[PDB]
Ligand binder design. Structure first.
Ligand SMILES: CC(C)(COP(=O)(O)OP(=O)(O)OC[C@H]1O[C@@H](n2cnc3c(N)ncnc32)[C@H](O)[C@@H]1OP(=O)(O)O)[C@@H](O)C(=O)NCCC(=O)NCCS
Ligand SMILES: CC(C)(COP(=O)(O)OP(=O)(O)OC[C@H]1O[C@@H](n2cnc3c(N)ncnc32)[C@H](O)[C@@H]1OP(=O)(O)O)[C@@H](O)C(=O)NCCC(=O)NCCS
Ligand SMILES: OC[C@H](O)[C@@H](O)CO
Ligand SMILES: OC[C@H](O)[C@@H](O)CO
Ligand SMILES: OC[C@H](O)[C@@H](O)CO
Ligand SMILES: OC[C@H](O)[C@@H](O)CO
Ligand SMILES: [Mg+2]
Ligand SMILES: [Mg+2]
Ligand code: NA
Ligand code: NA
Ligand code: NA
Ligand code: NA
Ligand code: NA
Ligand code: NA
Ligand code: NA
Ligand code: NA
Ligand code: NA
Ligand code: NA
Ligand code: NA
Ligand code: NA
Ligand code: NA
Ligand code: NA
Lengths: 759, 759
């Protein structure tokens, strides 16, 4: 109720409002950002410092890719916000500083999540774990991983082993949390700590009055931990020579302060996805002020952005080989949401929207940060074309439907976590649930719950379907039965996981940058959607004959006649896919969840398409045992054969209404199919996306689109001569990877996917 | 469903029943023990080994008493069930083995409960804490103490500071848990582990079905921890050369196995009271079998009992000087419940009941174990007289009302935790709550919530009582108001404490020896009952004039006229005390509690009578500022002046019905007042207790009685010449202490208490 000297100086010239009296970043942005409708002509190139710095770091990246292992990692230090000393690439050149450990790309040990995983990584990468670390996290501090395995059921373990429910967050950080790092820059740490003490105190009455007693005690302790984490953030920044007690006073500080908030997160937690948020336009407010004051030049502004983004290209976590199979390409998902439109109709695109995209030119293509364009048919044409140009040149961007999500939330300050999962910044988070194998679940329906590979009873004992010809109605009725069972086992596993993650690895530093009460969804994913839909289609429109072994188990199938396949705008099969999405959503919706997190669904797989595919036998659609499923909501490899419009249309039909956690689609088109020359390609790509994302009362539109503009021949050359493509980046599931960071098996998945040859 | 070879051999000759098919220790006792109605004539004396062993240990005890500090303690090892190597007094002589650390009386560090307390002890006793221990329990493993202080309210902190609610379990183990250690001997560890896996599995349906989701996950993890603790118990015993996977096969093993169960508890938890249970009669089953088989002699049987009891005299915990003021005399409360009657009318007194009492002769008087006689008017006269004789000779026993408690529980296998708090063994526990200052609460009523010493607003702001003469009705109405406030702050503090103790120091090894579902009570204690009652009496029957300072604060009082004081069988004041007990019980009964633990109350103080007394100013009864309150439910020092029958009658009036956690009374009578000679004293003491404990439909009877038979002159001699009384033991609050273990201030409290001079 009285802004001190620190706030005064930092906020000079800013338009006043609620944001000055309470934590309200959206209000600050709305009252202060400058919409930009111009083009990319104002952009500056890289400075010598930026190039010197990145070229050096790329040598570490090349090492990671050729060895498929970390450059280095700790074996005796438990990482915390303050554990490591300041680390640099070259202190004399960096404009934005901060590394997870004391050296670039050196990975930390984050033991609160589990000790067995660390032991696994040490063994896999030939390093010796310090016995003290093992002792502490086995006998003194229990871990998330052990808490989960102490409470799991034999049933869940069988599902994990058989490949029907595998890769859940029981052995790595859950992630899917985006603290509002912008708060550090806007308010400074002290202001945020005072606000947290007020939130803590606001719970005293309920505590004393016995209102939701356990929930109140839990939340009060969580807020105390958040407050403590904020204090540690100041100590961390001080190691780098910065005092962040007060708000950032200029562009360099706003960028640095925001990054420090994120740095505390990645020093303390190892969530699968550690997304950055929606920061580019927020940061433009500070950049614009300094530019107009003549304090910095445009090239200096681009340099600060380059150094921040460079640090986001350097986030690393020690993972096991098992994790590497589920989440390939050394992903981080430092996702940044760019542009979009405000509820008031103004565009939220700023010059900084262009500066972030420009990092793909100043420092070349890179898979991280995961730059995500919030697309609207109303975006400035200049921006639509520049983003299209950047996709054509680098294949490093993804696009999501702002015309769909902004109205769904009635909010213009939501960001994307990981790949396609939206959340209002600082007010919402997801309880990550990885994804379930829907394709194997169908086989279980046909085989009475017996696994086709292990020949073990995994699902409930049921009568296997008899006959020489499968009947759609019968198969679907049994499938519906096993989806009920799948939903219950899935939610039960997630209930245990998130109870334990809250208990043993509560993300204090990230939650410290959220409101007191955060909305939580229980995000359930489904893998193999197109395999399941196409399998039902073959059964329904063709004659599928089961090939059984001496036990009556259907281990293969023979199909007589053609059948419609997902991705060709044929309602006969597309309707089946839509139905599966709706059906599973309704089943998880009926189950009780931990902390009453609202169940949501995503059609997303990351590399579980390969992992589940390896553990799944021959399916009714004709897919061979061991073969990968499509990534996310994609049609199966090479089955979408009618062109871009047709496949984009099939995918857009999937209902975001029943998959609020997101629907991932990876679209790859050859340059000449997209257009005859550069200008036409930009226009055509922007046009294709406007059509795909088109939204009106009666048309939902697609939700997400990864865009690769490349010739398959070029990838083949890269597979043979990796040294020639050190920064080659490709979109693969709702995020990007450097092509060279993948294993050969994962590259084979990618190269055999659909390369669209026509509109 | 099929007893293996191990059970067969161990249970040969035992009468069969449910106990062989499920964990049911009571059933085993009922079907196998031998009631003993004879006298003490069969008792054997100490062996040379016993005397050699105890004489050596007493040198360590003398050292503890003269230095008022530990003989030694760990500074770099975090204690767990398996952390320490085997330790001995003299391995060649011990028949029952096991020590907490590697050396007799060396105290451990049990950090899960809090690190600041350990730092405090290191500083107080001039030892240096290993920096690694401090680091681990500050940054990696959060402690119970820090969890509590992170969630406390400013109000609770003010109450702690002012002395109205101080000494609660926020800085030491809560205790008040008695695992059924007899289970280890009866079933062996493997059987108990299989039973725990079955309990764990029985919760799967509720987990999957979303029934009380969080409670189910919590309990499943607790059972997993219990199972793990049982496994560790086997490793611990193996360090001593014993395989306890199977049930005990003879008397020595039954005693050893039972003790190992208890040893795991005191190696892993530092609860204020770590009581032993109700084991003497259970152990007699094994002793009797070996005696009849000619396997052991009576002297060998007494020797095994002596060595077990000797180990119970050696339990130690590292405490802070602050703890020492609240719980004086280096207490452990290794309470053992002896005798009693069964629901079927048979006495549960056995020859072993006599052997346990005999340890006070074989190894002399000792404050631990805290031997507690479950008294019944129907006990064999031979036992009544021997117990009376033991009290006359050693003042080391306490007595509790079996005719009251057995029918209340409708159970004959309940034990006493700490001093006077009953629980059905293996089925019930208490959430310890220490005690509240009822006397200071009365001053707050008179002073508008302002503390009479700190001159700070602690209670809610209220109008201080005006006038030159206090009026009972007005004072009582305000007091009732502040008791409401006291109850709410008290229960709120305990709710936080037990939520945090369950989270950060769950007593796995003790809970592993309980049924799946344990009944929990929230035990609230009240200190200063007689001060409050006498204050109301003075106000009601005399003329009490407040002496106020320049602020209107009543800092002293002048009383004109006599008034009845508690402890003289005068209903005018005794009724006031009864009312206060009922009144507070009804107020705590209305509040929500953590885990729905049933609120109960005890009139018990331990040394809080001295601590609260030091922090309480002059009271209306005439007590001077800083003076100690009476211990437990005792009349104030020297106010009970009408003889034993009169004071015993006043105390017996206090309603156990509203104080189910117990009512403590410390009775000290001079030898010649008790009787002219030994035989008459025994008869008279037994007679006094029969009268005090007399129970019928319309008469509840007293609940507890500490009995000291000594001349005050002897204590004065001991205060001057401590070297002359190395084993002198005295009952002081519901437990005993070696007189020399007390500080001078605590000795002054004891010596100025009432020494009854007549019947
Ligand atoms: C440090 C804290 C306890 C307040 O300290 P304070 O102003 O010095 O409080 P008090 O004056 O009441 O003293 C605390 C007492 O508890 C004792 N104590 C025991 N364990 C303790 C612990 N873990 N932390 C702090 N004090 C502790 C102190 O030594 C002191 O004893 P004393 O009165 O004999 O000297 C602070 O954690 C607090 O206010 N906690 C309440 C909950 C809270 O604010 N949580 C953070 C919300 S964002
Ligand atoms: C050890 C335990 C997991 C079962 O082990 P198991 O019979 O070998 O189980 P599975 O065959 O399903 O294998 C467990 C899998 O989880 C992995 N794992 C990851 N973290 C683990 C952890 N903390 N503990 C055990 N396994 C772990 C194992 O490496 C293995 O992976 P894999 O299939 O690729 O080899 C046991 O803790 C258990 O049954 N837990 C369920 C709950 C329970 O019984 N609690 C105790 C009740 S008293
Ligand atoms: O630890 C690095 C991973 O093993 C590699 O797959 C990253 O591309
Ligand atoms: O060894 C028992 C501990 O509680 C372990 O389970 C966690 O540290
Ligand atoms: O640590 C020992 C205690 O300080 C002493 O009071 C015991 O009598
Ligand atoms: O170890 C417990 C601490 O509070 C930790 O969570 C932050 O430093
Ligand atoms: Mg295993
Ligand atoms: Mg303090
Ligand atoms: Na390079
Ligand atoms: Na940290
Ligand atoms: Na809770
Ligand atoms: Na942490
Ligand atoms: Na729901
Ligand atoms: Na749609
Ligand atoms: Na088009
Ligand atoms: Na001695
Ligand atoms: Na232990
Ligand atoms: Na719970
Ligand atoms: Na423990
Ligand atoms: Na109640
Ligand atoms: Na009574
Ligand atoms: Na008598």
């Amino acid at each position: 109720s009285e802004l001190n000297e620190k706030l005064a100086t930092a906020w000079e010239g800013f338009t006043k409002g609620d944001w000055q009296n309470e934590v309200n970043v959206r209000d600050f942005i709305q009252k202060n950002y400058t919409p930009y409708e111009g083009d990319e002509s104002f952009l500056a190139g890289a400075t010598e410092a930026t190039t010197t710095l990145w070229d050096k770091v790329m040598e570490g990246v090349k090492l990671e890719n050729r060895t498929h292992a970390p450059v280095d990692f700790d074996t005796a230090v438990a990482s915390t916000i303050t554990s490591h000393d300041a680390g640099y690439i070259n202190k004399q050149l960096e404009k934005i500083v901060g590394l997870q450990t004391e050296a670039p790309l050196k990975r930390a040990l984050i033991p609160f999540g589990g000790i067995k995983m660390i032991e696994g990584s040490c063994k896999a990468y030939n390093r010796e774990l310090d016995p003290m670390i093992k002792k502490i996290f086995t006998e003194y501090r229990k871990t998330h991983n052990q808490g989960v395995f102490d409470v799991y059921t034999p049933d869940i373990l069988r599902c994990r082993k058989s490949g029907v429910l595998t890769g859940l967050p029981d052995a790595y950080g859950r992630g899917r949390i985006i603290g509002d790092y912008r708060r550090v820059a806007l308010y400074g740490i002290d202001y945020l700590m005072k606000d947290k003490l007020a939130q803590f105190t606001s719970l005293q009455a309920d505590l004393e009055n016995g209102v939701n007693l356990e929930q109140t005690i839990r939340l009060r302790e969580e807020i105390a931990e958040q407050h403590r984490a904020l204090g540690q953030m100041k100590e961390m920044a001080a190691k780098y020579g910065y005092d962040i007690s007060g708000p950032a006073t200029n562009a360099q500080e706003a960028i640095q302060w925001t990054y420090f908030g994120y740095l505390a997160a990645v020093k303390s937690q190892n969530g699968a996805a550690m997304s950055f948020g929606r920061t580019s336009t927020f940061l433009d407010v500070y950049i614009e002020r300094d530019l107009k004051a003549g304090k910095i030049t445009e090239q200096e502004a681009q340099e600060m952005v380059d150094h921040l983004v460079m640090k986001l290209r350097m986030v690393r976590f020690l993972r096991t080989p098992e994790y590497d199979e589920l989440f390939s390409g050394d992903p981080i998902w430092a996702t940044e949401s760019i542009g979009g439109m405000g509820l008031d109709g103004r565009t939220l695109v700023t010059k900084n929207s262009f500066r972030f995209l420009n990092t793909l030119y100043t420092m070349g293509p890179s898979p991280e940060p995961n730059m995500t364009i919030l697309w609207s048919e109303k975006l400035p044409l200049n921006f639509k074309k520049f983003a299209a140009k950047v996709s054509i040149d680098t294949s490093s961007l993804q696009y999501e439907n702002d015309d769909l999500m902004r109205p769904d939330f009635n909010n213009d300050d939501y960001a994307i976590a990981c790949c396609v999962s939206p959340m209002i910044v600082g007010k919402q988070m997801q309880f990550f649930g990885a994804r379930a194998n829907l394709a194997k679940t169908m086989l279980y329906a046909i085989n009475g719950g017996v696994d086709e590979k292990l020949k073990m009873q995994v699902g409930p004992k049921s009568e296997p379907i008899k006959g020489d010809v499968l009947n759609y109605d019968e198969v679907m009725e049994r499938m519906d039965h096993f989806m009920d069972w799948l939903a219950k086992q899935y939610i039960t596993a997630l209930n245990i996981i998130h109870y334990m993650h809250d208990k043993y690895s509560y993300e204090a530093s990230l939650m410290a940058l959220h409101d007191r009460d955060v909305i939580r969804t229980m995000a359930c994913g489904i893998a193999g959607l197109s395999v399941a839909a196409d399998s039902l289609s073959a059964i329904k429109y063709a004659k599928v004959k089961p090939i059984r072994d001496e036990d009556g188990l259907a281990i293969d199938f023979e199909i007589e006649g053609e059948y419609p396949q997902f991705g060709n705008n044929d309602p006969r099969v597309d309707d089946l896919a839509v139905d599966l999405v709706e059906r599973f959503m309704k089943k998880i919706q009926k189950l009780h969840t931990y902390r009453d997190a609202i169940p949501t669904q995503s059609v997303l797989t990351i590399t579980s398409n390969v992992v589940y595919g390896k553990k799944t036998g021959n399916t009714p659609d004709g897919r061979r045992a061991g073969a990968p499923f499509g990534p996310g909501a994609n049609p199966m490899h090479g089955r979408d054969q009618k062109g871009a419009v047709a496949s984009l249309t099939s995918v857009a039909k999937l209902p975001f209404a029943y998959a609020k956690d997101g629907i991932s689609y990876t679209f790859s088109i050859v340059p000449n199919a997209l257009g005859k020359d550069d200008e036409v390609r930009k226009t055509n790509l922007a046009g294709l996306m406007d059509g795909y994302f088109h939204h009106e009362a009666s048309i939902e539109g697609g939700q997400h689109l990864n865009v690769n503009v490349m010739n398959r021949e070029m990838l083949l050359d890269a597979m043979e001569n990796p040294e020639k493509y050190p920064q080659l980046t490709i979109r693969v599931s709702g995020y990007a990877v450097r092509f060279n960071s993948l294993t050969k098996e994962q590259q084979q998945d990618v190269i055999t996917r659909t390369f669209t040859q026509s509109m």
